[PDB]
A = this chain, B = another copy of it.
Amino acid sequence: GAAILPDLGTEILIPVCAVIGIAFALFQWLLVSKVKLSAVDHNVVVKCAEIQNAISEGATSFLFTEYKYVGIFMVAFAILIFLFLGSVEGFSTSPQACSYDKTKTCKPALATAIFSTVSFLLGGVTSLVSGFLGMKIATYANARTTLEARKGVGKAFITAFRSGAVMGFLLAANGLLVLYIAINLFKIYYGDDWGGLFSAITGYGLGGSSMALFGRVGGGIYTKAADVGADLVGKVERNIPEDDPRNPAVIADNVGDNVGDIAGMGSDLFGSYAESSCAALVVASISSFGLNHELTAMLYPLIVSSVGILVCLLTTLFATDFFEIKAVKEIEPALKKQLVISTVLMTIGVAVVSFVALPTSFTIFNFGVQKDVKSWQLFLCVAVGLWAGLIIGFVTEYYTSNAYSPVQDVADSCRTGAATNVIFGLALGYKSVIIPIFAIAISIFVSFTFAAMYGIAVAALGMLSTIATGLAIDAYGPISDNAGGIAEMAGMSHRIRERTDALDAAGNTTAAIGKGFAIGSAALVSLALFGAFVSRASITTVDVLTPKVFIGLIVGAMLPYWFSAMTMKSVGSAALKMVEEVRRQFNTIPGLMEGTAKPDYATCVKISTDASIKEMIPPGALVMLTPLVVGILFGVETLSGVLAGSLVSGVQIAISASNTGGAWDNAKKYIEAGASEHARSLGPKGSDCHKAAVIGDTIGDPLKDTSGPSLNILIKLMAVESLVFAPFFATHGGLLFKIF
């Protein structure tokens, strides 16, 4: 049956909401443009502008290099998709019978081979745009945040958070609008073949996360090579302030925050958004909505996201206008209130959407059978994901913010040296997985029971329904990070750096929270896609206790470690190179230490450019090739094992790495700020305790910024890729078992 909301209404609502989100982003960017500066005190304003330009040049320069390689890889890979999907039916142009209804005829498999290539390119391009737009706002807002900090934390908070919101609303609205357009264009061809339409559309998320993979790892090695190098020689060895302009690695470091923590993260969360929508859509496409051609219900996920944009617009206003921060201890709770407000409002929003966009009863495909499902049960599916998110954010804050005992004990353990700092930091991360896993598990059980793979997918989307706010609170952080870097490079008052340091500590926590959301929604969407892959591969049963599934399971569980071995070694090796270079400059450039000679920033930009562009290739290949190699050699049953294994295993290492890194960073921040008797007694800056904290912080650097966060991409990427190639693996795969 049709829903309360008409098909034509849905067709208007979605693009109108995207347009509202884009408008909001422009308006915010407009307000941020009010903070004036130019490279033509007035001294401090000119210096901030010059530093900003150095950073912006470097960041724009690296992405162009990275995106050139990735773009090339994207074109090659898109050719594989066309070939492999095309070969399933020998590239025939003959229409065949609908796999979901033998009484109807569908468009040739060749059409979907073509349109999967088209949507894959759409997603990859949108993914690149998402990250590039993010970089362009961050590299614009960084120094405006610095200048605003002269007036106080609240003013600087506002411009950093407004700017983060610029990225969030652009990314969420652009991602929605592109998806909506692609669906409508594809529909012109598919007509009534909604199964094929939406099966082709799943390339969008494959493209999204494919580009995201290289974006996260490439940017990740770039930034961390610089970070670790700058910090160890500057802070640990030569006893100078963090981000000192004498330090040759500082420009690369701050460019790094934009290239990794911003551009990479943007592409990454886009991949999340794209895959979840696409996952909800394919399952619906052969459920009652798709079979009965009911557009409003079919596009329920896009209606959920449309309303999410609106709810986040409102929520944003609380931190942007209705409240002002006057004290440092108000920052993290401000950020947290963004989560709390958006969740409570979105819960209402989703109730409304579920009331008017869904018929009260319908069926969801469930491994061959149409399962009876009620609209209130579907509301619980998206709401359990939405709430799992918040729980995850709360626990993550507790484990990464220096307002709480876990991180303060990590800082306190520095009193006995770096070895105890690291033992405590590792244990913290390990311990932190427990409640998010329980939350994920509860999410899976409810959504699975109520509505199978559709329910689970709509739970992932629910966790990502407030993505504009999520990106805002997250993008806020590297912008605040640069702001302090520019503050120090511009020789500003110590009072400025203290303010930026407060903002930056909050960003460390907010970044950990963002990783929590990525890993959570990744676990959810990957399960859904895995389930869909099983049907699409004509697997009757994924039975753990078969040789083929089990060998897949144990090898799948090892992939996240193989992947982490590569990325850790890359950072370690580039970092070592970076230390040698920074030492060489301090040791042989007359007056560098004196501050009467300028350092060579370009060489450090070069060390991390060379390492990242080269070393992003093997882990990208590990992830992308695995489904193809396992699928073609071992078959769909073994790929099944591999999907379940890498999901349940990858999730643990992802969470503990991101949180351990976060903890070390904020433990260091706590010693740096000395804002309590306990903190002061670990100080001052330069003390053996501080240096021990720096050691932990830098070990945590690759953990939380290269390997850890990329892991959620490994997991979600292999799942879409597997679903997309499913018919090709089913038909032409499992060779090793066929020759024998």
A-side interface residues toward B, CB under 8 Å?
Answer: 228, 232, 236-237, 367, 413, 415-420, 422-424, 426-431, 433-434, 437-438, 440-442, 444-445, 448-449, 523, 527, 530-531, 534, 541-547, 549-551, 553-558, 560-562, 564-566, 568-569, 571-572, 575-576, 579-580, 640, 644-645, 647-649, 651-653, 656, 694-695, 698-699, 702-703
Contact = CB atoms under 8 A, between A and B. Distances in A.
With most chain B CB atoms within 10 A of its CB, the pick from A554, A651, A699 is A554
A652 B557 contact: yes
A545 B422 CA distance: 38
Nearest to A229: B416
11 contacts: A232-B416, A427-B565, A434-B565, A441-B554, A441-B555, A448-B546, A541-B541, A544-B640, A544-B644, A557-B651, A649-B652
A561 B232 contact: no
Nearest to A567: B427
B551 A444 contact: yes
A692 B434 CA distance: 32
A722 to B, nearest CB: 14
Given A416-B232, A416-B576, A542-B544, A554 B523 contact: yes
A433 B555 contact: no
B420 A418 contact: no
B545 A543 contact: no
A232 B429 CA distance: 23
Contacts of A228: 419-420, 423
A530 B546 CA distance: 12
Contacts of A423: 228, 568, 571-572, 575, 699, 702
With most chain B CB atoms within 10 A of its CB, the pick from A228, A419, A531 is A419
A554 B444 contact: yes
A434 B560 CA distance: 11
Contact of A550 (B430, B433, B437, B448): B448
A731 B699 CA distance: 50
A554 B520 CA distance: 12
**9 cross-chain pairs, A with B, having the tightest CB-CB distances, nearest first:** A430-B565, A431-B565, A427-B568, A557-B648, A423-B572, A427-B569, A437-B558, A448-B547, A419-B698
Contacts of A576: 413, 415-416, 420
A118 to B, nearest CB: 30
Contacts of A547: 444-445, 448-449
B433 A558 contact: yes
Contacts of A441: 551, 554-555
A445 to B, nearest CB: 5
B417 A695 contact: yes
Contact of A572 (B413, B418, B702): B413
Contact of A558 (B427, B554, B568, B652): B652
Given A440-B554, A649-B648, A545 B568 contact: no
Nearest to A422: B699
A527 B550 CA distance: 9
Contact of A543 (B413, B543, B565): B543
A441 B694 CA distance: 40
Nearest to A572: B423
A694 B419 CA distance: 9
A430 B568 contact: yes
Nearest to A415: B576
A555 B437 contact: yes
A446 to B, nearest CB: 9
Contacts of A437: 554-555, 557-558
Contacts of A649: 557, 648-649, 652
A687 to B, nearest CB: 15
A269 to B, nearest CB: 22
Contacts of A575: 416, 419-420, 423
B557 A427 contact: no
B534 A545 contact: yes
A557 B546 CA distance: 19
Given A415-B576, A431-B565, 16 more contacts: A232-B416, A232-B419, A418-B418, A419-B698, A423-B568, A427-B564, A427-B568, A430-B562, A437-B558, A442-B551, A541-B543, A541-B545, A542-B545, A550-B644, A554-B648, A653-B653
A676 B653 CA distance: 37
Given A448-B547, A565-B431, A420 B579 contact: yes
Contacts of A449: 547
A167 to B, nearest CB: 30
Given A568-B427, A572-B420, A444 B550 contact: yes
A128 to B, nearest CB: 29
Nearest to A413: B576
A555 B419 contact: no
B431 A558 contact: no
Contacts of A557: 437, 557, 648-649, 651-652
A418 to B, nearest CB: 5
A569 B424 contact: yes
A576 B698 CA distance: 21
